[model samples]
Target: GPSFPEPKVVRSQGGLLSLKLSATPTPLAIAGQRATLLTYGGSFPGPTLRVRPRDTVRLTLENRLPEPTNLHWHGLPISPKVDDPFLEIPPGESWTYEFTVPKELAGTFWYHPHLHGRVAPQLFAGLLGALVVESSLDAIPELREAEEHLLVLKDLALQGGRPAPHTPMDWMNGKEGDLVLVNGALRPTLVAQKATLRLRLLNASNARYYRLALQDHPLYLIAADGGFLEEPLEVSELLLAPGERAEVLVRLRKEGRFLLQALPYDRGAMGMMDMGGMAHAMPQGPSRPETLLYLIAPKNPKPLPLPKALSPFPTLPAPVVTRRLVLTEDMMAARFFINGQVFDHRRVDLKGQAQTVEVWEVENQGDMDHPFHLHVHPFQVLSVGGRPFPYRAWKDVVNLKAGEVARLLVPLREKGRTVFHCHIVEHEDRGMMGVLEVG
Candidate 1:
């Protein structure tokens, strides 16, 4: 275990950053008896891009796959007009994204293909990466160290040794993997200085939600999707849905073996009515699989101790207006929808004014898990199942359990429209998405 290095800044060539999406086989055995697995850029988790605020990002996406493709800047506040056309790059062609970063943002964000109907397969095929945003002015002197690390949690579908073609079952019920990769490595290790180590976590799964927890140490959440929290919030388990991010500062005082694990949540109750059975009842693809992140604290490390608190965040008031979105399903097509309507790429659903607070009661009427994600801004979860959430962690995405209700207080500060939809690509393509305008 060693310290993670600062990411290299990649400048766009002639205002264009070229990227290729294709499959390469990984060599897993010495005898060459095992087949090569398909991966993006010859790696499972892809590469990392580090950029600063106000820097213009230009990406030239070349789709080498046999189908259509697009890219979406997850959690970033891009122009809502034109349907965020930046997410719709055609196959065999290239799309250029020429936009300056906002001066307000300073945290972690990510990108992935966002084409309709094919998002699940493309993403599962390895079309994702970590986008880190840093600011020299906002740097925390106390937390800056050599032990900081970035962990991108992902699930893969493989056959033999190579990435297999995604099937209908994989998208419908969420894909299960025998191997869990963190930054392209299995069971990777993180070394720290027996002090406070900053870890940025991203849930990049298509459908699964993760309940992350450490073996013995408590997780101090310093930030969420919007940015750093007002104060450190300690919790045993933190829930992360697709397209959501978390910045955690954990103290490693003992310097012993510790396992960062994710536990599975049952979707049986929701599945029984929607899919005629539970997720576990679907022949049980795999059993008791666990994803691990090992932390190895240096015997003698830096003298810095854990800080009692961190930066300050503006307080958001409660919403006076509330709306309910029912997560329903279409029985015949076996597809899911929101409030009895499927996603229409050409249609807009919600329109609002700037700096307004609105409450969204997301009800899961269907029998499957839906990770609801909204671009641009993060919302506060007021309650779950009529009970108040312990801490107010701002998040861009929250997973809704079947028959359960989650009330969120959304403060629409930025002007323009944003995309809101289920993080499950299959459901989104089939009409589980809508647009919201704040102006």
Candidate 2:
């Protein structure tokens, strides 16, 4: 019950890089009360920063939380003017993050703490991690690892034991169930030996949207979320939204037990009257459905299987500019906007050019369900209502449904000034969010 800890990478000189986050107080008691966890170094899905593409990630932040903290690199490609529209690091006080990493992109990125009204109690007191940005050297020869595996797929509500009490309609109806932990350990058991691995997945929920699959086999996928994916994509089911990412290539095959499920988005059938009409007055919990990664397989064996093709990715051309967005979920101002407008971090909306490719759309009249998200590239869904999911696959986060529209294409060439919102951290702190300037 103690093994899920590696994540320390400090490299400082000029390109600057320092990460040592922590929010402590977790014995694992939620309801009875004893949970105050918000980590990065103390661990809970935090630590995996492999850089390369241009390199300059200088994060210093050290908020021991009595309150106040900041870091958001979600989808990476920084530079919104960079004065900190991201917020908070005040409690103990400390904040550096220099930013420069931009050679276009590499793949699989993440980091949390937007701090807008405490960002769903500091990302449900666990913060977050995983940044990976390599960009060709061989693309991902199973991540040429020293044991690389960062699988963060959240969903926890607990009470006495700790980590419960976020309400606000569970962040505007992003209502999660209770599966919790992979890097925080809770059904964890990794032995491994048979070779090739390199997972890196990250769902960091605030409004659940996983579909990830791998019970028997099949799961190459390569890279998504703005990087390498013109080939891989074997698939069995790999949806994942809510600050998404997917860098797969697992292949232990004939070893032992394997279970990386995460299916549970059948929310159809009026989806509980649209979750009691957008959580009417907030506070409610029920409906249960399961399965979410267990994969143990790989006790010994090793022969060099896995690799029927991997590495290429290119296509992403046509699209000068598009943009549409619509989504809405008000519910007596519990808030959740896009067209109705909400997020105003100095406001910026749209402005591209560095590479260009645009395309947007989104549009989900919203009663619930709205994974959205976009911060530093990775688009190309092309259709949802018009139909198209045969494998164009490439996403930074997308989960419309409810009224559905989707579209997507965005390629902005990776410049800076990111963020497109609605990952549901209380409807992105009651504003749903926006802002993208690239250039």
Candidate 3:
């Protein structure tokens, strides 16, 4: 017997894809216990929203919680008025969002609350879901033929034997729980067909990273943060930071059992060395392989292997300005800052002209990790950890480990105030962010 739900797709006239989302209190069963929590569309991880590239969506949402709420189209690019993060819908108010999915990019996108101060707590309460640009992954023949599953990963802390309240430590060093969940269930089972299986993985934790590996099964990485890679790259392990997504293809040669697990990772030591005399207890990273589920495959005919050529990406241009920024914590001030300063809403940290190419060097000088994110413009990573990556792929988020340095080649956008910050909501809420004014 199964109980997990899939999102509903609706179509109106004139290519208008209508979607209705609301937040309401509901009961969630996790670890053999039921907890009443607030969720959207009646389920944890919400419902899968499906749309085509360049399609228009009319999304109307209401906040049933006794707080102000709004939504952010996590991975989509659009106009400010339409893609609003400042527009708030109160507890009983409903608002509609109209935006066009960019034809230029497509992949495993998502939606969640962007309200700075409350984001960490709200999302921890389970208020987000998957948004698929249907034209991207599903358009591939071999991928479409395989059994598709959405794996949304998160760890929620239970307070008073329930999963709703957050603690002070949660704000100090982001929230991470011991219980691992995949699509709202633990130790789930994925029944494989006679062919390959497409697994769309999303890391939605507030401040955690996962080194995912499947025992005895080779994972063909087809997609990264934004879209597909030039071709399928075979790997034994894939690392995912908060707010990052990846598409992995699993093909079984014969009938067998496979396991998808998240292995341990540690950035504490390196981060400590960077802080010199700093002695704050750093949040220990995931130190155990949280067994997600078992992938069962039946005897098969020939499996449809990955195509030699995936999506063709672009080459970055020479930068007009190379701006270097440091991510550091001012222990003396007891606050985290960017370039020795905390966030000031009225202050614009950097300014650039529209349609210009610039190389941004972001360095982590502290003893912890931070997933850096930029709004509106997508970036290409040139180097990480002082080593030359020199890859040609698009990325909106970059995970900078402790004592690590990352170089990004970004194309500045048109007139808009773009905010770049740590993808960890707690960090962002605590002023580990800045603004990039463009004109």
Candidate 4:
């Protein structure tokens, strides 16, 4: 028998969703060991927020912790003031965020603390949740009838029943926990019907990258960051970086048992001193692949057909403007920079006008990979590493390898000041970020 602990689902009512999330210290058991960690609503991985396009969300964050905190909607296209990373609620204080979900926005998003320096540690300590915007594609019977599961993936490194502090290497290359947990359970068992199964995955880890795959199964990627793709792409393994979300449809045929595993990947760490060659030197062994979850499907189950076509993926008009962004790092100083400058809340690194399209050429000069993330709007990857991107999908976070160049087509819709930073929160806190002011 397998144990499954699903996060509580909360849905909007009457086109409006009102909720309160309290950030507090709570005692919890990880892999049968006891530890105290931070949580929202007193639950690990918080709750799943379900809303529809154009629905209004009025949510409040109550800071019961001993430090300042704030919330950021990872991929929502709302006003910057609503997802304002600059707004911090000090201890014993509360902040309410109000915003309207756009009509064109329907996808898997997430929420977590965005406090300047505390982002990594707080998220690593267990404070994250899923935000889903119900899509019209759900009206498709095939997709509607599919058994859906929200898998929040995170990792934890415990020392003496508590999270261990970050070391220099952990700070340099974002920390990866020794224990990988799905919905805060170790090897949680999931039962699926003999039909199409929809797994909405959110990578909430601070830095760990997940190369997800189920042995002997092909994952049909149906949707990405912002919304559904036009057609499902079949792949054996999918790499999910921090703050990224994806949806995959899997059709089960006589599946008795399977394990969702995180296949080992070389993301190129500690290349600060020309160690690029050594990045691939990781010793391959059986311990490299870690089991994330166990699965079993009932026998003789009816198979469901997947949709041949999903919602149309939006295409941005030709770029009328072009901008260049450079990501750099200085290990000696223990800081990162965008365009040779550290982050400053008062600084506007890039400027754009609303209702226009821009082509952003972002280059990574660092020795390690950095997942580029932009707030307030999603962009299309025109090219990566000087090669044309294989597919067209709206994405908010794109991982750029060392010395990689990526061209993005961004359609500026909302007018406000937000940020574009590395999703590796530690790097972000270390100043590998910049502010974008849209006028």
Candidate 5:
């Protein structure tokens, strides 16, 4: 039997919904091993928040930890005044955040503590959760016909029986796990029908990239960070970076078993290692593969036909403004920057017009790759690495490998100052960010 820690799903009926998210100390087992962690609602990976579009979410967040922390709604397009990552709520204080989920925001989103200084450690301690905007997808017959599973993919390193204390190196190199877990289970297993299985995959990692593929199953990607992709595309593998989300469909046509594998991907060892390309030069064999979950299907299971069409998003118009951003690092100075200088909350990186269309060219000029994220606006990917992006979709977070360049079309809304930064929390905590004033 597959065992994935099913997150408690909280549902709404298109009305005002109120919920309490508190920082609770929890002692638990990790993949059968014992450890201590902090959680929301007394559970690792927090709780699954479900709400309909156009509904208001009034969440009261109470932080009881000694260190200051704040929450960031990963994929929501809202004003930073209310959801700024820099706004830290100190120990013994509570903040009530109210934001409406717009009708256009319907897909897999997530909520996590985004205080840069200790963001990595907090998330590693199990404070990540999934936020779902359910609407049109529910009306689709094929989507409704399958068994849906929410998989929270995250990694944390643990010693003998407890988490090893983090030092500057841990933060510098982006903490990676020797033991990878899905929904808190190291070896998650599940029973499935012979038909379609809907998997909402969330990369809840701090600074890791996933190259995922099911043994022999073709992954049908129907959505990305923003929402439905208008149609599904079949692929043998899927690549997702931290803070990104995707909706995938997999078919279990045969009764034979299948295993979901996460292939190894190194983010340049946090730019401290010199590999000399030996790994790529070496022969490829059975590389170290981590099993996410295993599935057992019924012999007489039925199969459902794939959806011919998904949600249709509006076509992108020509950009009226062009902005250039460069990702740089100054190790000797011990700082990271966007277009050369670090984030200065006092300074505005760029001025954006309300409801305006613009194109942003983000280029990585550092040794290691970085995940670029913007606040209050989602960008329609135009191209990457000199090639056109395969899917027509919107994204809030994108991965830029060393020397890689990406072009995104952004539609700025919600007047005020907001931010765009490297999602590798620690990286931004160290200085890779830029502030924007949308007026």
Candidate 6:
């Protein structure tokens, strides 16, 4: 009874993968109601592209929309030229992106419009897709025996069969849609037939943060944004910010329905908090817990032993350099900043030598949260709020709370100009971003 809607899987053939992604207005069935949405390849969440490490990927992007648009491969360790955020393809134009998947890069990645100043609206209009890198880890007995599913999470505000325009409060606090969706469906049901199930979750919202929990089941967190953890860590809840991804495993014991729910979380008081004359009618966070999916297991199922270890922990040499950056925001002006300056495409805010390890300390001085995202390389969280991180996992985005500080050990392997910014697209568009040039 696996009745949940899932994004179509597109895998690479031979040693090369070729695909053309066109951004166009496509009619989508949202809970059986027709709504026109901006989509890639004529689907809400687009296709799930699968490739192995070192495979050559030729992606042709056709801009069928009436506006200029581009794509960014989030968390993919590819060349800056292939993943350039500044490259814009105007309406009716097509561009080809050719790159080779890094030999060691195997994880849950995604693609979305990255055109500066328009990312929020474009993503809200529903233009995004998943790009997964396959690895030998998939051949593991436990994982191979389990049923795998991809859960791409997003939110939307429907207005006349289209996404509603953002309000002033939305721009100030960043946007969060009232209706949450899992793989472009509302409250879908998934039937489980085996003892083990794997769920790969991607939070593709503009600003919403998901605190996910499963009813009557433990979440075995096995992977983060970049790759798998050394071992599965069982927990009751896992919080994922916008532009973040996680892979979790669950074991069903008996016949029943288990609900994957997003619990209420305080992202700190946002919007109209410090403004004197502003009204306080806007919402601060999620009003209530929402179920993402319902999973029903059969009475008697085949059992597979959970693996004791996953991929080995990534190792990096001791950092030879340290840098500190501060995140600031001025809600009254509707502007955000990194290190006292707004984003300048021509400005290189930081510089480092290629193939070097550096410890970057990020301090969030704003009232709300901002998830830090870096391109070209993944990082290891050294500490949060000055406390040592519990587990070691490679990550590309790390959420920083108000007045909180986080330290990361980053290995800059690629040599090119890339960027680091808040994962909240609205915040990034407003200026909380900086360019990094690796020489």
TM-score of 4: 0.94
Writing each residue's lDDT as its tens digit, candidate 6 over 28-47 gives 78766788999999998999
lDDT of 2 at 40: 68
lDDT of model 4, residue 373: 96
**Per-residue error (Å), model 4, residue 110:** 0.6
Task: State which candidate has the highest lDDT.
Answer: 6
Candidate 4 RMSD computed on C-alpha atoms after optimal superposition onto the true structure? 3.1
Candidate 4 C-alpha lDDT tens digits along 200-288: 99999988888999977889998888888888888889999888889999877675888889998766665333355543323122226
Q: Summing lDDT over every window of 10 consecutive residues in candidate 1, give the lowest-scoring window.
A: 278-287
Cα TM-score of candidate 6:
0.96
lDDT, candidate 5, 298-381, per-residue tens: 777676888998877777666789999999876534477899888777888899888889999999998677889998899888
Q: TM-scores of all models?
A: 0.83, 0.32, 0.91, 0.94, 0.93, 0.96
Candidate 4: 10-residue stretch with minimal lDDT: 278-287
Give the per-residue lDDT of model 3 (tens digit) for 1-439. Answer: 5433234433343656787889877777865678776688888778878777677888889889889888887767666566666677889999999887777776787888877678887888888888877655466688778777778887776766556465555565667777788877777777766568788888888876778998887788888777877788889898888888888888786777778888888634222223777665555544666887887777764679677787778765667998988999653333678998877777889999777899899999987788898877777788899888633567788888888999998887546776788887877878888888878
Root-mean-square deviation (CA) per prediction: 4.5, 21.7, 3.4, 3.1, 3.4, 1.9
Candidate 5: residue 36 lDDT (0-100): 77
Candidate 3 C-alpha RMSD relative to the actual structure: 3.4
Of models 4 and 6, which has the larger TM-score? Answer: 6
Instruction: Give the RMSD in angstroms, all C-alphas superposed, for model 5.
Output: 3.4
Candidate lDDT (C-alpha), each: 0.66, 0.67, 0.76, 0.86, 0.81, 0.88
Model 6 scores worst on lDDT over the 10 consecutive residues at 278-287
Selected candidate, larger lDDT, 2 vs 6: 6
lDDT value for candidate 6?
Answer: 0.88
Q: Pick by TM-score: which candidate is best?
A: 6
The clash numbers for all candidates, in the given order, read: 6, 16, 1, 0, 3, 0
181 in model 4: Cα distance from truth in Å? 0.5
**Model 2 poorest 10 in a row by lDDT:** 267-276
